[PDB]
Design a binder for these strands. Sequence first.
RNA 1: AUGAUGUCAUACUUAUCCUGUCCCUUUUUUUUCCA
Lengths: 123, 786, 133, 112, 56, 112
Amino acid sequence: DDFKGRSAEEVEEIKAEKEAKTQAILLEMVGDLPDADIKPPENVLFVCKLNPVTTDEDLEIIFSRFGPIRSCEVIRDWKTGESLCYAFIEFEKEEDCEKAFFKMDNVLIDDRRIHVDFSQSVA
Amino acid sequence: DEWERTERERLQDLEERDAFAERVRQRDKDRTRNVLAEEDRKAMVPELRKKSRREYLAKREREKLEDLEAELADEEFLFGDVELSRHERQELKYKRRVRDLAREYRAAGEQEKLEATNRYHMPKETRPGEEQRRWEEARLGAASLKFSTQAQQKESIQAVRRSLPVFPFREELLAAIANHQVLIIEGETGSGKTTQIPQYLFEEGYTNKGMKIACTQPRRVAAMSVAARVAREMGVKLGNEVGYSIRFEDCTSERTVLRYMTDGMLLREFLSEPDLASYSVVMVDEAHERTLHTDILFGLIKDVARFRPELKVLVASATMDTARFSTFFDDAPVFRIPGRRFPVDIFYTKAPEADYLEACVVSVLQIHVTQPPGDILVFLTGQEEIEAACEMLQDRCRRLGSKIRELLVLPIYANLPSDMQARIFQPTPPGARKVVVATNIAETSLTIEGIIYVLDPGFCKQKSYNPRTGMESLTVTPCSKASANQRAGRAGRVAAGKCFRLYTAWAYQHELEETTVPEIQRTSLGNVVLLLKSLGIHDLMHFDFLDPPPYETLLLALEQLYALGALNHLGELTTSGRKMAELPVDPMLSKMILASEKYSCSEEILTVAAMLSVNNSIFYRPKDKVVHADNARVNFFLPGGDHLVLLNVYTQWAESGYSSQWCYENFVQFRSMRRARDVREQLEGLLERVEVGLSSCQGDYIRVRKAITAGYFYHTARLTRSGYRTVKQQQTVFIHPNSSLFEQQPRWLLYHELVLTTKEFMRQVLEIESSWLLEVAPHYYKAKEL
Amino acid sequence: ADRKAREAVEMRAQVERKMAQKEKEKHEEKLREMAQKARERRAGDGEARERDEIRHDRRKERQHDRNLSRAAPDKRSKLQRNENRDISEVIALGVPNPEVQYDQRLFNQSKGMDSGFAGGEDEIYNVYDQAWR
Amino acid sequence: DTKLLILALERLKEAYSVKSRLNQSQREELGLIEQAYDNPHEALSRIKRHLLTQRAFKEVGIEFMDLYSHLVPVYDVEPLEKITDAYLDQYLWYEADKRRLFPPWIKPADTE
Amino acid sequence: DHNIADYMTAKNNVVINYKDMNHTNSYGIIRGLQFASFIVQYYGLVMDLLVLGLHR
Amino acid sequence: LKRQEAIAQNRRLTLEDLEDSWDRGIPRINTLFQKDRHTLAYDKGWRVRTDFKQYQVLKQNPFWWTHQRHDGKLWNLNNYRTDMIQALGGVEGILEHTLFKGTYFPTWEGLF
RNA sequence: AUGAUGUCAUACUUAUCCUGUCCCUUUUUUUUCCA
C-alpha cells in the first residue's frame, strides 16, 4: 500500500491517473491513435460552438489578433463540405495560444457565444 | 375564402411567432451577464492540461463510443449478404475483434471490482420475475440423488400485392381521381387502401416536384405498423423516404416523400405551414373514427380543398359514412372497392337475454366443447367484468378437468401490463384452443390471426357528457349497428367465421342506431376551443363544422375559458390564453403550470402534470397479489393528496435511475411511468417558449397545493352533512375508494375527475384551503359562498 | 481480540487484493498484444459499392448524431435508444421474439399455504381426502 | 417483507387451528394476528421499531408437558413479542440460507 | 447486524415465572423463543468446527 | 429431461407428461404446481422450526417430520375404506346390525 | 363562588340505528444555436 495511504486528494488523483491510463489504453484498444498518448502541442485551440458561415479566413482574422497563426482548420463534413461549427486554430507560441484563450473564451462572434478551449487532439 | 382569412392570420402567425422567439432570445442575452504572470501561467497551464486531459478522457471514450457503435451499425446491412472484397472484409474482422477487445479490457476492470467486493467484511458498529424459477430449483435440488433470395422476397411481395381488392381496380381509380380532386373512396379493411394507394400515387409521381404524400391515422401504433408495411413493400429503409412522424418519435428524413402521421399531427402541421405546399396529396384514413381531430381536419382541409385545387383530397373510411362525407364535401364521387376476405355466419339468440355476462360464459363453453379447431374472440365491456369472466371460465376449467382441452383464457384491455398484452400474440400451442376476452380496444388496430369465432353481447361502455352538470359518465350503452357489423367484421380474415349476437334479429334491425355520435358532440372540448381561438377565428359559431356541438356545450366552453383567464370579458385571447394554447394539454392543467411560475414550484408542478397526463393506469392491482400490491402502494402515501403522491412516486422511480424492476417491485405500470416522463420532458422542451423558470419548491408543498388550486379552483367540493357536495352546483359527489384521502375525507376538496360511475365520483383529489380560493379567484369564488 | 482480528482480516484482504490486481494488469498487457496484432492481421465484387455505402451511411450517421446533440443536448439519447423500448411499438415494428411455459390444466388444482396437519391438532377427521362416494 | 410476515402469521395461527374455548390471552393473541393481517404496514413499522429500540422485555411463563417418561419445558411469551420474533425467525432463516451460512452437514434440513 | 444481535441476546435474558416463583435467566437459552432454532444451529456450527478442525 | 426438451423443442409441458407421475417423487411432483409456490419459496428452515415448536405449544405433534405444502402428501389410504367395507360384508351385511330398517328410509345411498 | 377554552374519559338523552352501503371505454398534440 501507500498508493492509498497518503491523503484522500492524491488518492483520487492516482485513481484519475488510472481513469486516464484506462481510457487511453481503451481508445487505442478500439483503435484510433497509432502511438499511445503522445503529449498534445501547446499551440492549437479547439474552438467550438461555431457558425457554418465563419470560415478559415475570418477565424484566422480574429485569432490573428493575439499571436502569429500557423493555420485555421475547420474540419469539413467531407462530401458536402459544410463547416462542422467547431475548429482547430494553430499558433506559434504558447503565449499566443494563452493570450488568445484568456480573451476569447465564451465571446459572441457572428451572434454566437462560441467556446474556446485548448486542443485535446492527439490528431 | 374564410380559408384566406385563415391563412392571412396564419402567415402573420408565423411572422409574429418567429419575431417573438427572436425578441425573447434578445431578452435573455440582456438578462444574462457573461464578461469572459510567469509562474501563474506555468501554474494554470498544468490545470488547463488537467481539464484538457479529463474532459478528453470522457471525450475520447465518447468518440470511441461513436465509432464503436458505428462499426456494427455499418456491418448490419452491407456484409452478411454481398460478395465483398479484401479491404472492408479484413476491416470487418478488425472492427469485430476490436470492439470485442474494448468490451473485454473494460470487463476485466469491472471483474476486479466485483471480485474484490465479494469478500467478507466484519460488520462495523456505528450508532426480474423469477420467484417461480428460484422455487423450481429448490425442488430439483431437494430432489437430486447423486453419489437471389432478396429478389425472391420481392417476387413474393409483388405476388401478394397483385391479389388485393385494389390491384385490379388499379388504373380506372387512378384516372378517376386524376379527374376529381376530392374523391371519396369507400372500402373495407384488408383491401390495402392504406398501403397500396400511396404506392400507386408515388410510382405515378405525385412526389415529383419534390412533393409529399400524407397518410393520416388515428393511432400511433397503427401508423408505425402501416409505415413498416409500406416501407417493406417499397424495398427501402423505414425512415428515409417512407417515414412516420408521431408524438415523441420522428421516423422521417429529407428523403421522405411518403409521410404518415396522426390527425392531431396534421392539425399541428397546420401549426407549421398553412398551405402544406410541400404535400401534393393528403390521404386521410378511416375518417369514420370520429375524433375531435378528424372533425377539425375535415373543416380545415375542406377550406384547403376549395383554395388549393392542385392539391389532392383523399378520404377513405370503412363504413357507410360516405353519405355525410360527400354531402359535407360537396358530394365528391365515391369509388367503391369490394373488399371482404371470408364469410361470417352471423347468428342471433333466439330471444332477448337477462344475464348476458353469464351468457357469454356458457356460450364459449359450448363452442369450445363442440366445435372444430379454431380460436375465439369474445367481447365484454371492460376490466372488472372481464376478469370476472376469466374467473368463471377458468373455474369451470378447474371443475371439468381432463374432460375438456386446454382453454387459453387471455384477457386484454388498455391498462393491463404490456407483457400481458403481448402474451396473446404468441402462436397457439398445438391442439389447445385460445380464447381472447377483449374490450372494444379489440374493435380496431389489433390484428389477431386465427380468430374464427366472435361473440358480441351487443353492448359497449360509452362516455356520455352532459354539460348542464359538467358530468361525463362512462356508462353502459347498447352498441350501434355499425359497431355490431364491424365487431363481426373483425373476424373471417383467414377463414369462415361465426358471429354470435346475444340479441335477436328483431332488436338488431329495429332498435339499432347507425353511428356513435360524432365525437365533438359528446366530448368535452376545452382544448379544441382553446385551439381554434389560438388560431383566432373570433366567430366560433358560424364556423365550418361537420357536426357542431350544442350551443350549450360551446357556452360552457366559453365560460370555462374566460373564468380561467384565457378569455377577456369579451371572449378573445389573453397572453395567458395563447401561451396556454400552445400546450397540447387541457387549460386547467395549463393554468396550474402557469401558477408554478408564481409559486416557484416549477419542477413539482411539471411532474404532477406529467402524471395527470396518463394516470388512469398507474398502479397494477391484481387479485392474486392484492395485499402486497395495496402495500407497495400504501408505502408512498403522502400527506396532502394524490398529486404529491404521484410526485414522490415519479421522484423515486427516476431516483432509481428509470428502473423497470423498480416499478415491478413497487406495483406501478411502467408504461404509464415512462410515457409520463416523456410528456414531462417535452413539456420542458415547451417550457422555454412558455417562459417558465426552472425552479424547485424546496420541499414547500404549500406552494404545490396552491398552484394546484390556481389551476383547478373550479374542480372543488365542500363538506355537507348530507355528504360531500360540489362548491358551485351543490350536486352530490362521492370520494373514490382508492383515494389517498378516501378515509381522511377532508372538509375542502379538490378533484381532477367528475364521472358518476355506479355513484357520482371524482378522481385524483386533494385537500385544500378555502382561503387559497379567495387568494386566487375572488372574482369567481366569493367569500360568502365559503 | 476483536480489534486484533479486524486488523488481520483487513491486512490479509488488501494483500490478496493487490496480488490479484497486478495479475489482472498482466492479463491486460496480453490483451494489448491481442489488439495490436489484431489490426495488423486485419490490414492485410460487392465491397467497393457496399463500401461507398459504408462511408455514406456511417458519415450521414455522424451528421445526424452531431446534429442531434446540437439541436438538443443529446437528441441522440432522445431519439435512437428511446426508439426501442415500448411494446405496441415493437409489435408494429415486426421485430421478432423480442423459459418453460406449459399447459394450464396443470395449475391451481390445489390452493392453500398451510400444511393440512392443522398445526398439531389431532381430534379432527382428516384421514382420507375424498368424500366417500 | 409481506411474504415473510404472511408466513409468520400463518405459523402462529396454526396453534389455534381448532378455535377452542381458548381463553382471554389466546383471544387477544388472535386479535393481534388478525389486525396485523389486515394492515401489514402498521405491523412492519412496529416490528422494525421494536428491533431497533427495545432491550428490556416482559416476563415469560413456564410449565411442563408430561410425556410420562420425562417432562418438556414449554414457554409462554407475550403476543406482541411473539409476532416480532416470528418475523425475525423467518427473516434470519431466509437470509442465512441464501448467503449459505450453514454447511450441508447441519441436518434437520429442508431437503429430506 | 449489531442491532439484531443485541435484540436476540437481550431477549434471552428475561424473568421466568411459574405459579409464584420468579427468577432471571442469565446463563443459558430460552428454547421457547422463535429464533432459538437459529441460535442453536449456529452454536452447533461452532462446535462442529471444534470437532472437525478447519481443514477437514 | 422433459424440462430440457420442453426448452429445446420449446414446447409447453402438457398434462400428458405429468399425469403419469403425478403423485410420485419425494418432495412430490404435484407440489411444483400448487397455488402458493410464490410465497413458499420464502419459507426456509421449516423443518427445524416444526421440531422446535414443541417448546412453545402444550401439545405433541405426530407429524413433526413433514409438511404437507412443502413435502407433498405422502400417503393415500382411500382404498382402506373400500376394502374395510368389503371385508365387514358390504353395506348390506353392515347395516343388518343397525337401526337402519327401523327408520323406514327407503334406501341407504342418501344417508347423511 | 359558576369564564371560555379545550382532543378528558365517564355518565346521560331520543320505545332515536343492526339494515338506507361498493372498482374507467377508446386514444392523438409541433421545438430549434449543442460543446
